[PDB]
Amino acid sequence: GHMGNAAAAKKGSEQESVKEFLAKAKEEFLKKWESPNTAQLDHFDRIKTLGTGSFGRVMLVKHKETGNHYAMKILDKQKVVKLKQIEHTLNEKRILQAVNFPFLVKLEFSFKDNSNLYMVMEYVPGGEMFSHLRRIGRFSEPHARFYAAQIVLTFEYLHSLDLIYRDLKPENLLIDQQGYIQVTDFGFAKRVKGRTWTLCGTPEYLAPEIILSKGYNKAVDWWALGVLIYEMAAGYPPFFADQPIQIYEKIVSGKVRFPSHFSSDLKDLLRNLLQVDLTKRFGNLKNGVNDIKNHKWFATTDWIAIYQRKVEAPFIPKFKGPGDTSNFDDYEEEEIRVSINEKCGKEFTEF
């Protein structure tokens, strides 16, 4: 067969150890989820806006007593209510408090005032994958694989907790000072052991069964991994067009084309992730995540060494010191106004 006796034994043991790890991690998550660190705004100096959204913004801050830098996501409670994202905001905080994994950003403090909600997390100084990818053009297959391996492990972890992620894309992946990935956004993540039905995500990364309004499951995240690996390795995503509706027609068609520089191993992996037939999609079969991890394209990947952060990264972002924001774009700076009247108190009582 493909493996001789020593390699088959090694792989079986590895796969059993993963099960042992996940069972412990699930116990730890559930204890934190059931029995969940405040601070206040004047504990921090505000330095610079690192990124913006419809909710509010993310700012670099420095914690006054300790001198540590953090990234502070500020959400305007009234805008959250208007954008129908109360449950999403409360869920994101609950997830971030409860998870623990080397590629998931660490929430350090949270708090709220009359106007806003605040989530203070580790600062990840290396910037968005998105920026680096557009700047360099494309990543080599080894460079793409190093990142892809981290997403595979992170999804193996999240899915073990019954969490579906649902908004993978380069925009949502940050690079830390050692060149490893950090996932920070959980705005569409949901606990789903069974199926779920909401239309959500980003057009280029939507799985066909989401577009087709079916009940769907964690396999949508493995489709999205396909999209990400393709985009990292090509420099552009597999399905694009001027308008979303034309993207969707490409996604559901069952057709994908590849650059001539893609390896055959890469193309085989992507045809198995970008599989419109759920009964054939990798990550959704009886062998689960192991179909992905044991694929030829990942044959050089030492999964434990990636988890331990002992692999030399392909790319180490520029870092001139704590507080360096050079790997982030410039955004228009708006004041943080706090109303003298409490807004939306009942909606956000659990935050």
Added chain:
Amino acid sequence: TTYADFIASGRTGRRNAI
């Protein structure tokens, strides 16, 4: 090329969720 088609899509910047 396919890259040129990508540039023509106008979706080369940060993409919003739906």
